[PDB]
Amino acid sequence: KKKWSKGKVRDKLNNLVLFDKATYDKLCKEVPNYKLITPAVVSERLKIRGSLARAALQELLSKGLIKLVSKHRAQVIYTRNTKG
C-alpha cells in the first residue's frame, strides 16, 4: 500500500554471541580500564551482544578487575578499580 514515509535503514549490527580469540582478550585488557563500564558501552565498544556483554562483566567483577557502582533490573554500572 502507498507509504507516506521513509525508513532510515542502517548497516545492521552483527553482534558476537560468544567470544573469539580476537575479542575475549580485547575484553580482558581494555574493558576493566574504562572509567565507565556497562553492558551497553562494552557491547558497542567491542561489538558483542548485550547478554554476552552482561555475562562477560560479572566474572570480571568476581575476578575483582572491576568495581560495581550500582545494580538495577534495567541498569548495571561498573567502574575501574580505584587506588589510594
Partner: peptide
Amino acid sequence: VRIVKHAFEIIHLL
C-alpha cells in the same frame, strides 16, 4: 527518578 538517579551516577564516573 530511577533514570535520573542512575544518570547522575554515570555523570560522576565520566
